[PDB]
Amino acid sequence: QDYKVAEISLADWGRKEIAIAETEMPGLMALREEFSAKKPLQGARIAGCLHMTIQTAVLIETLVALGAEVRWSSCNIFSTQDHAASAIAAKGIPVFAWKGETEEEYWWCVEQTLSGPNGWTPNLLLDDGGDLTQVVHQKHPKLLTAIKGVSEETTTGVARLYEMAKHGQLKIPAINVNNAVTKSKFDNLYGCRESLLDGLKRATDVMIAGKVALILGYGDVGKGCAQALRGQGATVLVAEADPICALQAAMEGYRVVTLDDVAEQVDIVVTAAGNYHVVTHDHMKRMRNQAILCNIGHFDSEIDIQSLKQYQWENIKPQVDHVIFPDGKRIIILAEGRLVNLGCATGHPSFVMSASFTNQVLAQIELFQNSSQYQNQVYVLPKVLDEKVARLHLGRIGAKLTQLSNEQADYIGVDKNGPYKPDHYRY
Amino acid sequence: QDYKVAEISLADWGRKEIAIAETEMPGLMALREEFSAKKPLQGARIAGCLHMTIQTAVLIETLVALGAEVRWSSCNIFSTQDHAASAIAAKGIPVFAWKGETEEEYWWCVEQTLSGPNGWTPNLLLDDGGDLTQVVHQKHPKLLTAIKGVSEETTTGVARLYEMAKHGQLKIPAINVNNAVTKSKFDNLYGCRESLLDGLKRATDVMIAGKVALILGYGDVGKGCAQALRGQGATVLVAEADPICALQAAMEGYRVVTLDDVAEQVDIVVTAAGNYHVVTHDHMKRMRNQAILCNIGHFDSEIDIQSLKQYQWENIKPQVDHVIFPDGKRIIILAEGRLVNLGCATGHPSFVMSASFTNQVLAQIELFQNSSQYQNQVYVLPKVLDEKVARLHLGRIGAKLTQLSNEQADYIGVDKNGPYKPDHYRY
Numbered sequence: 073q074d075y076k077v078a079e080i081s082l083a084d085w086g087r088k089e090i091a092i093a094e095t096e097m098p099g100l101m102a103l104r105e106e107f108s109a110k111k112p113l114q115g116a117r118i119a120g121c122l123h124m125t126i127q128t129a130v131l132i133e134t135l136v137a138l139g140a141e142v143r144w145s146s147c148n149i150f151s152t153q154d155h156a157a158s159a160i161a162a163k164g165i166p167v168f169a170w171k172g173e174t175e176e177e178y179w180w181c182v183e184q185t186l187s188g189p190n191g192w193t194p195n196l197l198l199d200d201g202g203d204l205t206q207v208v209h210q211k212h213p214k215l216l217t218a219i220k221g222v223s224e225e226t227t228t229g230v231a232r233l234y235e236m237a238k239h240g241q242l243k244i245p246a247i248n249v250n251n252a253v254t255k256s257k258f259d260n261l262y263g264c265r266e267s268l269l270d271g272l273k274r275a276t277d278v279m280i281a282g283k284v285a286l287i288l289g290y291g292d293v294g295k296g297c298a299q300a301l302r303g304q305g306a307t308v309l310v311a312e313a314d315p316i317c318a319l320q321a322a323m324e325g326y327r328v329v330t331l332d333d334v335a336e337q338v339d340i341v342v343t344a345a346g347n348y349h350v351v352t353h354d355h356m357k358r359m360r361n362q363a364i365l366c367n368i369g370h371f372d373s374e375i376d377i378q379s380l381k382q383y384q385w386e387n388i389k390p391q392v393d394h395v396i397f398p399d400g401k402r403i404i405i406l407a408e409g410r411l412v413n414l415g416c417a418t419g420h421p422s423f424v425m426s427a428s429f430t431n432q433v434l435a436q437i438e439l440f441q442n443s444s445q446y447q448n449q450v451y452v453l454p455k456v457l458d459e460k461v462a463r464l465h466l467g468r469i470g471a472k473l474t475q476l477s478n479e480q481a482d483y484i485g486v487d488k489n490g491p492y493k494p495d496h497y498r499y
Numbered sequence: 500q501d502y503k504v505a506e507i508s509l510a511d512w513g514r515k516e517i518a519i520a521e522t523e524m525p526g527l528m529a530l531r532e533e534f535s536a537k538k539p540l541q542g543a544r545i546a547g548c549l550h551m552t553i554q555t556a557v558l559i560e561t562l563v564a565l566g567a568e569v570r571w572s573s574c575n576i577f578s579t580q581d582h583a584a585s586a587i588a589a590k591g592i593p594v595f596a597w598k599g600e601t602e603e604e605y606w607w608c609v610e611q612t613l614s615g616p617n618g619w620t621p622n623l624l625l626d627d628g629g630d631l632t633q634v635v636h637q638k639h640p641k642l643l644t645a646i647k648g649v650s651e652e653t654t655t656g657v658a659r660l661y662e663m664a665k666h667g668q669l670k671i672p673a674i675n676v677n678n679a680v681t682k683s684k685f686d687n688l689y690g691c692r693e694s695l696l697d698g699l700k701r702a703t704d705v706m707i708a709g710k711v712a713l714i715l716g717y718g719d720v721g722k723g724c725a726q727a728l729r730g731q732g733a734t735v736l737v738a739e740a741d742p743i744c745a746l747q748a749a750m751e752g753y754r755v756v757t758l759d760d761v762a763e764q765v766d767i768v769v770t771a772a773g774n775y776h777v778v779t780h781d782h783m784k785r786m787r788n789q790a791i792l793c794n795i796g797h798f799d800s801e802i803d804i805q806s807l808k809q810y811q812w813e814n815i816k817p818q819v820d821h822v823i824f825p826d827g828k829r830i831i832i833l834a835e836g837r838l839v840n841l842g843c844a845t846g847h848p849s850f851v852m853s854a855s856f857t858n859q860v861l862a863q864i865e866l867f868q869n870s871s872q873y874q875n876q877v878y879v880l881p882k883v884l885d886e887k888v889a890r891l892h893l894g895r896i897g898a899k900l901t902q903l904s905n906e907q908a909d910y911i912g913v914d915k916n917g918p919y920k921p922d923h924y925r926y
């Protein structure tokens with residue numbers, strides 16, 4: 073029993089949804105077709121810390137199909153889909169993950185990925201948020217020597233990598249997967265455009281139309297969140313500290329405001345900043361009865377949930393809580409301030425996760441084979457691989473590329489087969 | 500009479516609209532307030548080749564207010580606003596520009612900016628499309644030695660600069676103004692979102708709702724063009740050679756198609772590719788009666804207009820022509836295949852042009868003062884100046900920035916005053 077999941081009998085349900093998801097994830101299935109015979113990951117031993125969803129199940133089985141051995145944990149206490157974890161466990165793949173972990177169980181799960189029977193230890197890390205990278209660096213420095221590198225999924229995780237590199241604390245090569253174009257501009261944006269609304273609806277069933285919704289942060293995540301609620305008839309407000317992002321939001325028709333000014337006016341608050349206490353106690357005290365607060369950024373401290381411990385909490389249903397102020401006023405807190413799309417729904421849909429996870433597999437292949445040519449710094453995959461990820465997803469959604477003629481390729485200074493853009497291109 | 504314009508008596512009308520535009524261009528007016536006393540451009544002699552519009556008039560007078568002497572020409576034969584040129588000429592500023600220049604008049608106008616009375620010669624170039632840069636390099640190499648650098652406005656122009664640098668043909672420093680974030684992601688995108696529709700309507704008065712419109716190219720320009728027509732109820736098709744840009748368009752709900760497939764289906768065709776003959780004779784032969792074709796990319800060869808010389812052309816009104824095929828079928832060609840927003844309307848509105856032109860002024864200041872620390876390569880302005888451009892435009896449209904606290908700045912690794920993003924950030 074080299075696994076730990078909530079209920080193993082959910083395996084067959086997990087398997088059925090994984091079968092569906094495979095048809096939504098052509099990038100991963102294309103990598104299996106291209107590489108399953110050559111097994112480029114034979115000899116790879118991957119410790120993974122990434123939301124144990126149906127989509128991640130397809131990622132795991134792609135790594136295994138390419139020859140890898142893996143041990144897996146989720147990177148959020150609420151993000152596991154128990155039936156996905158059970159389907160993976162039933163294949164004999166070590167997974168330590170369930171929805172609703174305590175803090176202690178969470179770190180125990182991560183630790184289980186770092187050693188396996190017969191002296192199994194990872195030579196690769198696959199991380200989403202930097203927790204696994206931190207544990208290894210801080211608590212298992214002997215394991216560091218054997219680790220060829222880490223590939224990192226999300227914006228907050230890559231920020232932690234850059235802080236480490238700035239102070240000489242990064243001891244392994246790192247591939248920034250977030251800043252592949254086919255990740256940051258798809259997952260972060262179009263993923264949240266669908267899964268923010270999903271989390272809100274499943275949790276509260278709230279009408280979006282006519283509501284005043286505030287998005288704190290207008291980066292890739294906040295951009296998608298704004299589109300989502302705007303499409304359903306909300307008046308969308310945006311807060312930003314970056315004047316360029318603020319000008320973008322203003323040019324899309326959003327009023328750019330501070331929560332200091334508008335706290336009494338909002339029905340729904342979404343933190344998308346990757347920052348600390350952007351929603352304070354005073355903000356929440358000023359909010360109307362039954363205001364809905366959630367966080368779609370990576371950590372639980374975008375909202376100061378600590379400041380709410382002084383009040384009575386009344387649970388409505390799992391991951392949906394009332395906080396009752398002394399005058400009787402209530403606010404609704406989603407997922408105890410943690411990732412609302414994964415905590416209250418199922419995260420992003422399979423199709424866009426295929427783009428993110430095709431980048432992950434390519435990074436693991438590149439680290440496994442060529443980590444010796446990398447320094448202890450953070451890199452991105454080259455554009456030719458970024459474009460390949462895009463190409464592998466066009467067929468599913470019926471998009472037909474125009475082929476450049478010789479003179480057209482020459483005219484704009486590109487090879488007919490790409491890359492089509494200079495490295496400084498922002499899309 | 501050190502100028503050449505269509506009708507000098509239009510000056511007072513030009514002056515009235517320039518006065519209005521100043522209130523729409525807070526970035527330029529802010530630079531005047533900050534720098535008009537210190538005159539950082541005293542001693543600067545700027546030859547400019549850039550659409551002689553009301554907006555460019557505000558740019559010119561900002562350069563002059565900062566101490567510069569300029570000589571100006573337009574970079575398109577149809578893009579001049581005659582009343583803007585007349586207002587500039589009436590100030591005593593040398594301008595050589597009118598709407599409807601012949602090819603010979605066009606290059607004569609450019610040449611006039613390269614020498615003035617009393618042995619006046621430029622020490623700076625301000626270019627939009629690379630024509631002035633080409634003329635100097637190819638036909639005035641003695642003038643090159645005195646030129647401190649060029650600042651270049653648009654995507655096609657910077658591509659020409661990179662081709663030059665790749666072959667050792669660039670002999671002066673160049674600042675890529677297009678790829679300031681506050682240019683490429685605002686001018687190219689939101690500018691075209693309004694001025695493409697403007698050009699189409701003024702030229703043809705065509706209903707957009709219910710039409711099938713094809714956008715060739717889904718870069719910054721094509722992205723804005725698509726939004727424009729989609730907002731007015733067109734079915735918008737997109738063609739792309741770049742799989743990443745294609746996937747973006749598909750994820751916004753556009754069918755990504757080839758003109759080879761859909762020629763019989765389109766009512767309106769817009770080339771936004773910066774490429775050569777993306778619309779061919781056979782495409783146009785297959786199009787329905789009264790199909791509308793236009794180009795919003797920088798040069799007249801996105802559509803093969805040459806292939807239409809074999810047919811009878813019947814003018815409808817200035818810059819709006821019928822091409823009559825042998826079977827009686829007609830197509831409508833806008834502006835002889837040249838920039839439709841500037842040829843058939845007035846280009847982008849003042850507010851977004853203020854963002855582009857605030858970057859231009861900063862680049863000219865940086866070249867004038869520090870060109871000796873630059874090599875003969877193409878550079879961009881640093882992010883701190885990019886963010887300053889954004890800041891200077893927030894007040895006009897009522898956007899209020901959130902100020903980071905000390906711990907929030909530290910938490911994401913930035914200075915409270917910026918820059919807020921790493922150089923690889925794509926917005």
Ligand SMILES: NC(=O)c1ccc[n+]([C@@H]2O[C@H](COP(=O)([O-])OP(=O)(O)OC[C@H]3O[C@@H](n4cnc5c(N)ncnc54)[C@H](O)[C@@H]3O)[C@@H](O)[C@H]2O)c1
Nearest residue numbers: 226227228289291292293311312313314345346347369370
């Ligand atoms: N839930 C998901 O599925 C998912 C997906 C991708 C990323 N994320 C996470 O979401 C967060 C945001 O990611 P991103 O890619 O959008 O980052 P980003 O850097 O592109 O955008 C964050 C924005 O927040 C703004 N901001 C920071 N502090 C602020 C403050 N106090 N007030 C207002 N605005 C402020 C910044 O100016 C920036 O524009 C990260 O923590 C990332 O890991 C979650």
Ligand SMILES: NC(=O)c1ccc[n+]([C@@H]2O[C@H](COP(=O)([O-])OP(=O)(O)OC[C@H]3O[C@@H](n4cnc5c(N)ncnc54)[C@H](O)[C@@H]3O)[C@@H](O)[C@H]2O)c1
Nearest residue numbers: 653654655716718719720738739740741772773774796797
């Ligand atoms: N009219 C204006 O006011 C205005 C403003 C800005 C830029 N421009 C001009 O517009 C052009 C496009 O600028 P941009 O910033 O969008 O460039 P971009 O590079 O961002 O976008 C151009 C796109 O065209 C695509 N493409 C190239 N050849 C193609 C083909 N044969 N078929 C289909 N797609 C093809 C490329 O893949 C690319 O995505 C340039 O010439 C630029 O100078 C005009």
Ligand SMILES: Nc1ncnc2c1ncn2[C@@H]1O[C@H](CO)[C@@H](O)[C@H]1O
Nearest residue numbers: 123125127128200225226418419420
């Ligand atoms: N359904 C999902 N399965 C796995 N990871 C997901 C899912 N939805 C979002 N994520 C990831 O969560 C990360 C933030 O922790 C994002 O960068 C995104 O890739």
Ligand SMILES: Nc1ncnc2c1ncn2[C@@H]1O[C@H](CO)[C@@H](O)[C@H]1O
Nearest residue numbers: 550552554555627652653845846847
């Ligand atoms: N109204 C306008 N005045 C001046 N330049 C403009 C205007 N509209 C668009 N342009 C410029 O035309 C360039 C293409 O030649 C674009 O990069 C854009 O900056």
